[PDB]
Design a protein around this ligand. Structure first.
Ligand SMILES: NC(=O)c1ccc[n+]([C@@H]2O[C@H](COP(=O)([O-])OP(=O)(O)OC[C@H]3O[C@@H](n4cnc5c(N)ncnc54)[C@H](OP(=O)(O)O)[C@@H]3O)[C@@H](O)[C@H]2O)c1
Lengths: 48, 1210, 93
């Protein structure tokens, strides 16, 4: 029930330029064959 | 999602606070987690409007780190973000720095008449060298004089005086002129004697230059070549100008004089003529800060302008390069007449026979009252500089006056000539009492036009006190012919029926009963009447900032009045001792001197201290600004690590090590950590070593000054640095030379690692160690023998010579199967795969320890421990030499790497100031705990969002007990729980500081709450009535002052005992920048803030910690944020700068540190007996970079007190 | 727990762990049957005491194997305290 994916968003700003990395990372997916996150923290009492 | 990211920035920076001084874009995210089902459900359901929460985890400034949580209306988290590292689009250069901090840099109201500094006197070496060269010549100087002048005529006439334009006479006359010095029995041997003298310091640059010129002047003796280009274009000429303590101290006094002038006069359009190489320019601009609006680098020739541009690039924006021939009219050369407030003559007036006309040209360029700084010759002495000065090409031009060259004019004849050319005489001069300063003695002269007067009626109020009576009599006797009105007190003025509207008031009421101590008796209305009839005003106070805070309240009231009534010229004079005359009359005369186009600064306020006048200037305190910005960028400051704590901190990314300022800033808690010893580290281990479950501690070897003994010691330090403060338990105090320099620390480090490894594991009967340090192996074997444990050594290079990438089957074949624990000490991390394969072949469940589990770059005992460590080390000392791996801290920081921890490496911390004075990456003032856990910190008046933020910051910085006090604390108990989660017990006292009884009840309730004694107070109660004083009413004054004034008085009287068992670590009183510049309609507030400042200053003078912060508009939190006045205050952005919530915390921390430093220096016999000694206690803040383009909108730009904060325009 | 107990949650922010987790902890024991909590454990290592000992479920429970008499006495003495926590056939297959 997991899937680790290494992703890289390569970018090139012009047709004359080379393809360069713009973003990269990993993706860890909890998947099914077809409350997952912590409940949000209680709102801070004082807030301007 | 980008909006969610913007939430992090919003948390980091409030709207209008300008905390986000640079554009941050995301560059790394530790984790983004999204629940696609919930996001799709929200998208399809149409309830796009969703809630969010975000934590700005890291906000120092280098890169923001945010943790975001976006949830639906039902609080079902749609997605979250963890450590979304926002980083600047481009590195945060100094242009993005925040210059909020400022200090009251005090200086003389006029430049000192005599610049006699013992630090700049001719040293013994120079004072012997000059008489030594005299000894060569002094015998027959009387006969020499004329011949020496003849030789000095090499440029114009000496080549004909004896037909010395021809080869024979040239060769004869060169050596004859040198013998004019060497004749008395020394002669040619003087050639070698000169070198012998040059072998020592203070002899080389001068007499070596003499020797060099004496061996090549033959072509110049006949006037056929450049006098100095023959000397390799320079051999020592610049060194002679700078290094020699005859040409040097003149430049030092020039720097001092220019500093004084640029302090009293700021935004000056300066112009140095004859700079050449710019040595004088270098020295004068070496001042930490000076109020030069512009600096015209000028010389007769433009050949030096490239060198000036390269040397003075930092001041290039301030500096403009324009050639000028003072022998020629400046107007013909493109310069604007009377456009410069200051002109500097860098030893150039001697190079013109038109001295009078050149000085007239300088006057033409100078504005009325401008200062001409003259570095020039005077009071000639033949036996000291003659034959070497005589060579130059144009310096002799000037002999037309009848004396040698352009005459060595005496200061009296300098005064005569200077007056003849349109100036106010030589009122300042450099000391030339004995010698070595005549050749370059400096003088300052004012441009005499609309000169200081030294008619409208003069009104005197006060005179009740006997000293006030004496001063009134002195005013009467010294006042010029003017209409005069006199009143005993201000009530008498209130009873007055005829008061001129053009009155020039001289108020001595503060020397008598003060206004802000007796406002009840219609004194406020009398002050209103005064302002109504006051067009000019002078006020006198007796040590207000140190003895009489009420007089300081009056000073602040006048400070605000000068803003409310700009047409009303006001001066205030605070005197430490009134008995110590004649200066109040001159200030009163000045008040009528409303010169707008003249350089004369209007002197808004003055202080007579130590029998001398002083004027303050709010110069950016670059120390505190650098500390604040170090949180945001790598601020580097030259710090002496040998005498200041400098830790070789590891970078946040753990990419490299850098030297960081480790100054703890006087944390007073040393009883729980009993007798925290100070260690001056000579050698230390870069990596922190783990101990027996106690934690990671670096190994440091150094000296401890036990009754001045440099006792060698080896200790475990949490803050590896040049200087450490460590508990005695973690110290080995033996001075055994076997623990030799460098090597001893190496062995102790290795043995600490080995002992840790053996102790944590032992339970086991046999273990394995992978790639241990070369020294380590034998030590580990010794420890195993001493603890009865079979330790196996594995290395990737007896030892088991394994290899990285070895097959698991090979490991099974070779590795013993009795191992129960594995310890990987491999500095190279490539052996991680080998370790993993070991885990598959070793005993299942085998304990695994990595190098990170014993060695780390971040840290954040039984007496027998170090005894065992040293006993083990003494077994294996011979394994290596002492200096097996020794590198200086600078080399380690520049070249060492965290990812490759070179175990068994040792840092050689420099000890000499020359070796230790290094560029250290400054540390934020709040980067380390500043507060003790056994004391209560009382935030008086701090219960709004500002107070809550300050309290939470305090607890984050070691404040385990905080008390918030206010007349109506509306604090959520949930916030109290939140701060308690941070580790500090916070309570609301509901204490009305306005009443003594209420304060006493609250302080007794503290004991009822069992809280520790109050170790610090943050006094910031506030009430505002924005109305001008004339339209103000006494009840408003009472409402504004009583909270402030009465609260400070009550709290001081409560803690007015420096001998008490619980002296306050600090007494921070929250002042507004209006207390330093005023504001329209806040006279009461400014007076109260000045009362706070004066009370803090006198409390420090009393031996009690205290400080004041002159805060700007706090957009982040507090009055501006809670009143929703961001637009209104940003409309005056150019007037008051923003002070962010966390910047406010930084300012408070800096004020606390300043107070503690002042107290400790007082323990070091710092008197703090006057205002000058307490420039740091008033942490001026909130003044933005003053743009002249906005000078019209700025209602206080004309104030010279802020001169150094004015942006240059030309 | 990722479900007194500290009801943590997998994928919790390290800042939250700092806020809630006690700072006096010197050792961490991860018995999570579900291995998704490995990230939570890693984040714990960044907030707990540096050098904190770390034990995983594999360090206590394993599917491959390849004493003082008082040990079982202590085991049963402890078990007799908490027997009522569940029924006999809580999970029998
Ligand atoms: N213009 C500036 O330079 C500037 C800007 C902001 C702050 N500051 C300084 O920072 C400190 C805190 O200011 P702030 O931001 O928190 O302003 P604020 O938001 O208006 O809070 C000040 C509060 O102190 C309360 N207070 C508490 N005990 C009091 C008493 N005994 N008498 C009268 N009022 C009392 C006032 O009434 P309540 O109890 O009902 O709240 C007032 O609301 C002040 O000392 C101020 O000088 C200066």
């Amino acid at each position: 029930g997991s899937m680790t994916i290494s992703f890289k968003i390569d970018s090139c700003l012009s047709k004359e330029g080379n393809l360069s990395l713009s973003a990269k990372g990993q993706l860890a997916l909890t998947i099914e064959d077809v409350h997952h996150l912590p409940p949000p923290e209680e709102e801070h009492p004082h807030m301007n | 999602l980008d909006v969610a990211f913007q939430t992090v920035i919003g948390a980091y920076s409030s709207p209008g606070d300008r905390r986000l001084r640079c554009l941050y874009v995301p560059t790394h995210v530790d984790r983004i987690t999204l629940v696609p089902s919930l996001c799709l459900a929200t998208a399809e359901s149409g309830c796009e409007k969703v809630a969010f929460n975000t934590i700005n985890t890291y906000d120092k400034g280098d890169y923001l780190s945010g943790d975001i949580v976006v949830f639906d209306a039902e609080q079902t988290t749609l997605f979250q973000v963890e450590n979304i590292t926002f980083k600047p689009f481009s590195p945060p250069d100094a242009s993005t720095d925040h210059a909020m901090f400022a200090r009251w840099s005090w200086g003389p109201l006029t430049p000192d008449s005599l610049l006699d500094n013992p630090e700049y006197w001719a040293t013994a070496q120079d004072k012997e060298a000059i008489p030594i060269i005299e000894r060569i010549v002094y015998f027959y100087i009387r006969s020499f004089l004329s011949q020496l002048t003849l030789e000095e005529r090499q440029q114009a006439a000496f080549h004909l005086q004896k037909q010395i334009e021809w080869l024979e006479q040239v060769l004869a006359s060169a050596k004859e002129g040198r013998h004019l010095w060497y004749d008395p029995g020394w002669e040619n041997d003087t050639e070698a004697q000169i070198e012998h003298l040059c072998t020592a310091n203070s002899y080389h640059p001068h007499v070596r230059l003499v020797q060099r010129v004496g061996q090549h002047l033959l072509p110049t003796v006949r006037s056929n070549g450049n006098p100095f280009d023959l000397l390799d274009h320079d051999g020592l000429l610049t060194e002679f100008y700078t290094n020699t303590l005859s040409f040097g101290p003149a430049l030092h006094y020039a720097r001092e004089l220019v500093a004084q002038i640029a302090h009293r006069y700021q935004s000056m359009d300066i112009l140095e003529i004859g700079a050449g190489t710019g040595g004088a320019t270098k020295y004068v601009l070496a001042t930490p800060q000076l109020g030069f609006n512009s600096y015209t680098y000028t010389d007769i020739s433009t050949g030096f302008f490239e060198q000036a541009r390269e040397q003075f690039a930092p001041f290039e924006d301030r500096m403009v390069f324009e050639p000028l021939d003072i022998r020629r009219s400046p107007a013909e050369q493109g310069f604007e007449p009377h456009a410069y407030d200051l002109i500097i003559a860098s030893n150039v007036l001697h190079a013109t026979p038109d001295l009078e006309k050149t000085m007239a040209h300088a006057r033409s360029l100078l504005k009325p009252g401008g200062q001409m700084v003259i570095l020039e010759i005077t009071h000639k002495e033949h036996t000291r500089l003659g034959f070497i000065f005589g060579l130059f090409a144009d310096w002799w031009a000037g002999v037309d006056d009848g004396r040698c060259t352009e005459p060595f004019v005496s200061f009296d004849r300098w005064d005569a000539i200077l007056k003849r050319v349109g100036f106010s005489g030589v009122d300042s001069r450099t000391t030339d009492r004995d010698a070595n300063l005549f050749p370059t003695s400096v003088f300052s002269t004012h441009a005499i036009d609309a000169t200081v007067e030294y008619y409208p009626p003069l009104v005197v109020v006060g005179g009740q006190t006997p000293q006030s009576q004496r001063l009134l009599n002195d005013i009467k006797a010294i006042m010029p012919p003017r209409p005069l009105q006199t009143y005993k007190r201000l009530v008498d003025l209130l009873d007055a029926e005829e008061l001129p509207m053009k009155s020039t008031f001289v108020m001595l009421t503060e020397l008598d009963e003060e206004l802000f101590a007796g406002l009840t008796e219609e004194t406020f209305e009398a002050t209103k009447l005064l302002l109504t009839y006051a067009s000019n005003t002078v006020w006198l106070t007796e040590n207000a900032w140190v003895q009489h805070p009420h007089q300081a309240s009056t000073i602040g009231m006048l400070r605000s009045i000068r803003r409310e009534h700009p047409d009303l010229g006001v001066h205030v004079l605070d005197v430490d001792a009134v008995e110590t005359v004649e200066q109040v009359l001159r200030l009163e005369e000045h008040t009528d001197e409303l010169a707008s186009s003249t350089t004369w600064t209007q002197e808004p306020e003055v202080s007579w201290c130590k029998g001398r006048p002083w004027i303050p200037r709010l110069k950016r305190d670059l120390a505190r600004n650098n500390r604040m910005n170090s949180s945001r960028r790598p601020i580097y400051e030259m710090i002496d690590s040998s005498r200041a704590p400098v830790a070789l901190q590891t970078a946040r990314d753990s990419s490299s090590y850098f030297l960081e300022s480790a100054e703890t800033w006087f944390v007073p808690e040393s009883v729980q950590q009993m007798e925290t010893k100070t260690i001056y580290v000579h050698f230390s281990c870069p990596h922190a070593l783990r101990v027996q479950a106690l934690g990671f501690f670096y190994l440091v070897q150094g000296h401890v000054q036990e009754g001045n003994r440099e006792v060698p010691v080896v200790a475990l330090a949490e803050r590896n640095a040049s200087i450490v403060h460590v508990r005695p338990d973690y110290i080995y105090t033996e001075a055994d030379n076997n623990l030799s320099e460098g090597g001893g620390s190496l062995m102790v480090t290795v043995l600490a690692a080995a002992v840790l490894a053996e102790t944590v594991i032992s339970v086991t009967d046999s273990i394995l160690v992978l790639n241990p340090p070369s020294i380590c192996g034998q030590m580990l074997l010794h420890a195993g023998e001493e603890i009865g444990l079979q330790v196996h050594l594995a290395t990737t290079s007896s030892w088991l010579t394994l290899h990285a990438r070895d097959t698991d089957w090979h490991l099974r074949r070779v590795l013993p199967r009795g191992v129960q624990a594995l310890v990987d000490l491999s500095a190279d991390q490539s052996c991680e795969g080998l370790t993993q394969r070991m885990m598959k072949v070793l005993m299942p469940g085998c304990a695994h320890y990595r190098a990170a589990d014993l060695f780390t770059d971040t840290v954040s005992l039984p007496a027998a421990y170090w005894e065992h460590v040293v006993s083990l080390a003494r077994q294996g000392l011979p394994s290596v030499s002492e200096g097996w791996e020794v590198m200086p801290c600078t080399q380690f920081a520049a070249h060492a790497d965290k990812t490759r921890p070179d175990l068994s490496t040792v840092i050689s911390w420099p000890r000499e100031s020359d070796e230790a004075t290094l560029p250290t990456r400054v540390r934020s003032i709040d980067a380390e705990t500043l507060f003790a856990a056994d004391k209560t910190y009382l935030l008086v008046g701090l219960t709004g969002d500002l107070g809550r933020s300050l309290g939470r910051w305090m607890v984050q910085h070691g404040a385990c007990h905080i008390v918030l006090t206010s007349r109506n604390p509306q604090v959520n108990p949930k916030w109290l729980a939140h701060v308690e989660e941070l580790g500090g017990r916070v309570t609301v006292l509901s204490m009305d500081v306005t009443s003594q009884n209420s304060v006493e009840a609250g302080l007794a309730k503290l004991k009822d709450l069992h809280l520790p004694p109050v170790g610090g107070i943050a006094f910031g109660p506030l009430v505002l009535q924005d109305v001008m004083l004339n339209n103000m009413e006494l009840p408003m004054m009472e409402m504004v002052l009583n909270p402030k004034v009465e609260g400070v008085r009550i709290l001081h009287e409560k803690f007015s005992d420096p001998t008490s068992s619980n002296p306050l670590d600090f007494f921070v009183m929250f002042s507004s920048i209006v207390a330093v510049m005023g504001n329209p309609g806040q006279a009461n507030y400014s007076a109260a803030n000045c009362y706070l400042q004066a009370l803090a200053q006198q409390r420090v003078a009393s031996g009690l910690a205290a400080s004041t912060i002159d805060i700007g508009a706090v957009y982040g939190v507090g009055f501006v944020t809670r009143a929703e006045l961001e637009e209104d205050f940003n409309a005056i952005r150019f007037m008051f700068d923003s002070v962010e919530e966390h910047e406010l915390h930084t300012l408070f921390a800096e004020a606390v540190v300043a107070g503690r430093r002042a107290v400790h220096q007082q323990e070091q016999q710092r008197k703090f007996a006057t205002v000058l000694d307490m420039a740091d206690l008033e942490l001026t803040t909130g003044i933005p970079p003053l743009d002249p383009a906005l000078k019209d909108r700025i209602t206080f730009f004309d104030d010279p007190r802020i001169g150094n904060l004015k942006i240059p325009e030309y």
